[PDB]
Amino acid sequence: GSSGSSGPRLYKEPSAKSNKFIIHNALSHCCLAGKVNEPQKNRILEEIEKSKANHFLILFRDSSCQFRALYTLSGETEELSRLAGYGPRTVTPAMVEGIYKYNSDRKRFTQIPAKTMSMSVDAFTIQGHLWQSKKSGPSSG
Incomplete structure (x- = not known):
């Protein structure tokens, strides 16, 4: 057949x-x-403080394209929920184009060798077909 x-x-x-x-x-x-x-920064600083999340990601425009919106990583899964800003209510690891971390030693930004979520992340950029218009729909069964 065809499945798995x-x-x-x-x-x-x-x-x-x-x-x-x-x-x-x-x-x-x-x-x-x-x-x-x-004014916003504060709003973000708060949201986080207000949020009971431990892992927070920064949504950029495209390739460390400044901050667009903040999101929290679901400890239950690998999905990301929309904390504040403006974007997709939630974000999946399938839509995540690339991932990045934050050099807490050099105070810089780095990329991840993986395309999956991980505590070693501190920045990500969803796909491009997301912003652009074309279509949308779930997929499971």
């Missing part, structure tokens, strides 16, 4: 590697650093 997909996973204790504080800075770093983003 993944399901459950292994079973290894969790690892508290929250990167919220790393983001709070990413904003004051440049993502949302500036007088023009003085």
Whole structure:
């Protein structure tokens, strides 16, 4: 026939590697650093503080194209929920074009060798067909 997909996973204790504080800075770093983003930045700094999330990602326009919207990573899965800003209510790892991290040692930005979510991430950019218009629909069965 024609079918076959993944399901459950292994079973290894969790690892508290929250990167919220790393983001709070990413904003004051440049993502949302500036007088023009003085009122917003705060709004973002709050949302995060208000949010009970530990992992926060920064949604850019395309290729570290400044900050567009903030999102939280679902510890239950790999999907991302829309925290604040303006974009897709949620974001899947299938739509994620690329992923990046934040050099907490060099205070810079880096890319991930993987296309999947991970605590070693601090920035991502959804696909391009998203912004553009064409079509949209789920897929599972």
